[PDB]
Structures are given as C-alpha cells and as structure tokens.
Design a protein around this motif. Sequence first.
Motif, PDB file in Angstrom:
ATOM      1  N   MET A 138      -1.837  12.150 -17.397  1.00 15.55           N
ATOM      2  CA  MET A 138      -1.586  10.879 -16.750  1.00 15.55           C
ATOM      3  C   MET A 138      -2.241  10.989 -15.200  1.00 15.55           C
ATOM      4  O   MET A 138      -3.062  10.018 -15.034  1.00 15.55           O
ATOM      5  N   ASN A 139      -2.004  11.928 -14.505  1.00 15.34           N
ATOM      6  CA  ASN A 139      -2.830  12.004 -13.234  1.00 15.34           C
ATOM      7  C   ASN A 139      -4.193  12.052 -13.412  1.00 15.34           C
ATOM      8  O   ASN A 139      -4.800  11.454 -12.231  1.00 15.34           O
ATOM      9  N   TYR A 172      -6.159   0.082  -5.262  1.00 16.83           N
ATOM     10  CA  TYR A 172      -5.349   0.447  -6.035  1.00 16.83           C
ATOM     11  C   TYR A 172      -3.810   0.661  -5.889  1.00 16.83           C
ATOM     12  O   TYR A 172      -2.875   0.361  -6.493  1.00 16.83           O
ATOM     13  N   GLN A 173      -3.471   1.281  -4.488  1.00 17.44           N
ATOM     14  CA  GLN A 173      -2.419   1.609  -4.195  1.00 17.44           C
ATOM     15  C   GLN A 173      -1.613   0.212  -3.875  1.00 17.44           C
ATOM     16  O   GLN A 173      -0.709   0.294  -4.095  1.00 17.44           O
ATOM     17  N   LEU A 217       4.032  11.215  -8.486  1.00 14.53           N
ATOM     18  CA  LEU A 217       3.263  11.520  -9.713  1.00 14.53           C
ATOM     19  C   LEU A 217       2.417  12.766  -9.626  1.00 14.53           C
ATOM     20  O   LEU A 217       2.376  13.646 -10.431  1.00 14.53           O
ATOM     21  N   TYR A 218       1.686  12.825  -8.614  1.00 12.34           N
ATOM     22  CA  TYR A 218       0.543  13.860  -8.374  1.00 12.34           C
ATOM     23  C   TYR A 218       1.205  15.284  -7.686  1.00 12.34           C
ATOM     24  O   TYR A 218       0.616  16.356  -7.769  1.00 12.34           O
ATOM     25  N   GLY A 259       2.745   1.676  -3.258  1.00 18.96           N
ATOM     26  CA  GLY A 259       1.741   2.547  -4.252  1.00 18.96           C
ATOM     27  C   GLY A 259       1.394   4.062  -4.054  1.00 18.96           C
ATOM     28  O   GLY A 259       1.448   4.837  -4.919  1.00 18.96           O
ATOM     29  N   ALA A 260       1.021   4.294  -2.799  1.00 16.67           N
ATOM     30  CA  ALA A 260       0.820   5.642  -2.497  1.00 16.67           C
ATOM     31  C   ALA A 260       2.216   6.409  -2.569  1.00 16.67           C
ATOM     32  O   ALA A 260       2.050   7.398  -3.132  1.00 16.67           O
ATOM     33  N   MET A 288       0.795  -1.058   0.097  1.00 18.61           N
ATOM     34  CA  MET A 288      -0.099   0.022  -0.016  1.00 18.61           C
ATOM     35  C   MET A 288       0.919   1.383  -0.005  1.00 18.61           C
ATOM     36  O   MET A 288       0.639   2.078  -0.744  1.00 18.61           O
ATOM     37  N   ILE A 309      -9.525   5.699 -10.312  1.00 18.13           N
ATOM     38  CA  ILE A 309      -9.742   5.161  -8.904  1.00 18.13           C
ATOM     39  C   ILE A 309     -11.279   5.254  -8.716  1.00 18.13           C
ATOM     40  O   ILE A 309     -11.955   4.548  -8.055  1.00 18.13           O
ATOM     41  N   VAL A 354      -5.473   8.298 -14.105  1.00 18.49           N
ATOM     42  CA  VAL A 354      -5.358   7.641 -12.762  1.00 18.49           C
ATOM     43  C   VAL A 354      -6.706   7.930 -11.747  1.00 18.49           C
ATOM     44  O   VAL A 354      -6.991   7.104 -11.211  1.00 18.49           O
ATOM     45  N   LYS A 355      -6.724   9.299 -11.804  1.00 20.75           N
ATOM     46  CA  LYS A 355      -7.928   9.721 -10.727  1.00 20.75           C
ATOM     47  C   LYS A 355      -9.116   9.275 -11.383  1.00 20.75           C
ATOM     48  O   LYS A 355     -10.092   8.692 -10.582  1.00 20.75           O
ATOM     49  N   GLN A 404      -8.757   3.341  -3.353  1.00 20.26           N
ATOM     50  CA  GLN A 404      -7.418   3.776  -3.161  1.00 20.26           C
ATOM     51  C   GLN A 404      -6.596   2.687  -2.631  1.00 20.26           C
ATOM     52  O   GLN A 404      -5.617   2.487  -3.197  1.00 20.26           O
TER      53      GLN A 404
END
Lengths: 177, 182
Positions: B113-114, B151-152, A158-159, A151-152, A148, B121, B117-118, B148
């Motif tokens: 890309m951001n 996905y994480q 990226l964000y 991945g976070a 987790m 999710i 991905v948003k 989240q």
Amino acid sequence: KRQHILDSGFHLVLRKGFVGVGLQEILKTSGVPKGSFYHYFESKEAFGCELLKHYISDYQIRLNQLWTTETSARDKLMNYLQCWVKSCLIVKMAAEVADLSEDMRLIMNDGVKRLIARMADLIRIGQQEGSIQTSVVPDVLAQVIYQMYLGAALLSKLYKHKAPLFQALESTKMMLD
Amino acid sequence: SEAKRQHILDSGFHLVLRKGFVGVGLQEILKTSGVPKGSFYHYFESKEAFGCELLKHYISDYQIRLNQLWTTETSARDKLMNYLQCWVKDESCLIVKMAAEVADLSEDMRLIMNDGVKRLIARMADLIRIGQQEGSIQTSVVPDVLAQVIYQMYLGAALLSKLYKHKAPLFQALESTKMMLD
C-alpha cells in the motif's frame, strides 16, 4: 469512580475505535464489575457521547493554553501545528461513520468546524498584525491547512513515520507567506 | 477462471470499502462472493494472500485508469485537474480504512500500500513538472512538494467529507488547487 471508566474507555477507543468495542471490554480494562456500568452511564451510546464531549472540552482547554499568549498569531498557529508532530481519532471516527449515531457524528462535526473557525480567526488577526503575509482569505486558508494536516497524519500513520507531517510544517511556512 | 478470480477480488474489494480487512472473516468474504470455500482456496491460499492480491489488483487497475485519463493531448494542468475532479465524483476510503486499522495489518500489505501511494505522488510530481516546463502551471513550488501538498489536502478533504456526509470539503480543495497552480 466514573472518570476511571471514561479514561479507561478513552484509551480503548484510541486503540480499537468505538463501534468494534463492546460494553464487556470497557468493564475489564477499568477493573470495575459489570453491574456497575449502568450505575454511572445510561448506555454504551450515552458513554460515547460523554467521551466525545469530554475529548472536545479538553481540546478547547489545550487550545486556550496554547493561544492566550504574548506572541503573534503566526507563532500561535505554528505552535499548534507543531504539536501534531509530538487526532488519529478523526481517522478512526471517519473510518466508522456509517455506524456512528447521528448525535455523535454531529458533535464531532461541530467540533471540527469550531476548530477550523478558530484557526481562521487567527489567520485574520495574523494578516491584520502583518505576521501572516498571504492575501488568501482566512476561511479558505484555515481549511487548506487543516485538510493538509489530516492527510499528512493519515500518511504518517500508514508509513509508520512522520515525514508527511514534517513536509506539512515546511509547506505551511510557505503558505503563510 | 481468471474472470472468477477477478470476481472474488471484486467481491472482496467491496466488502473492504464497507468494513475493512482485519474485521472480516472468510465466511463473509465467501458469502459475499457466492463461492464455496474449497473453490476460494484454489485461487488464494489464505485470507492474507488474498488481501495482498486485492491491493495489488487495486493498484494495477488504478494505474491503467491513470494511463487513460493522462494520455490525451491536453495540458499537464488539465490532466491534473481532471484526475482530481474524478477524485471528487466518487478509493480514498480504502486509505482511510486501512490507515485506521494499520496496527493490525501485515507488513506485506502495508508495504504494498505504501509503495502504491508513493508511486501516485511521484506520477503527480512528474505531471506537475511537465506542466511547469510548458507554462501551463505557473507556480514555482517544486514538484515534489506540490504533489504532496495537493495529495495530502485531498485525503484530508475526503476524510472530512465522510465525517460531514457531503463533499463540501472536496469541492473547496478543487477551488484551492487552482490558486496553487497559478
């Protein structure tokens, strides 16, 4: 000094990765001349092996600082996880794995597994003391938590902010129950 | 013409799974595709335009592929285990690669890309909520949190799988996603 070559090298792999950077670039950022590389180090590859062992050893030292302490398993674990909020290396190394040598890739791989293993031992002690109140098996929970967080951390990079990792700390509180 | 454009993107796309984006020049990109430079430039004005179109085309196909997987008449739960199970069969490299080189990526590409991905999710979110409405997903954890978490954990499992060079971590994520839905 040889530490100043390692250190200067470590700060460059943080920014550029291992593969993409040649032996030239490591020499200028450390100041040290070009003939002198092969005095301290047999090759780019023995240098890489030595950075990673040093990174790994320093990591286990931070861990011991952090978990030889008077508090409860849960707090130790949360302490550690909080330190992720303030390894982009696992990403860069995972991003280059094809080009990593086996010797290096195996070091990292052993490192990660010792890490997960120690998180699990702490979940077990935790459940034993009664501070971690989930029933899920340690070796499983350790892995979920660790995956987790990687991945976070990828999504935080990226964000360009840490909302994923802040969600990951919130979610951990729920799973430890 | 449109199929040529697609060929070029698909050439580029393979290149980028192997080597990333900032690392490559047009030359490799031209060499891979088989197209002369003059041609490539009729389709894309710059390495950067092309990168933007590559990611857009990737996202556009991804959602079409999600539309198929998820418009059958099964559970929300099974739809979600399906998708994930597909994750595991062999996409995640692209996020790992691009995250890796994020410092050199144009803002434009990073934003595209951001947002992709948003959106993913949020589709998982929509699907977890549909599953909780019907009773196929018994967990009470709120959809926006669970999507989240899931996905994480899969991205981090995909990352370790590359490091280990086998998918044991992704296999465990699969087994774990079942506990979490109950």
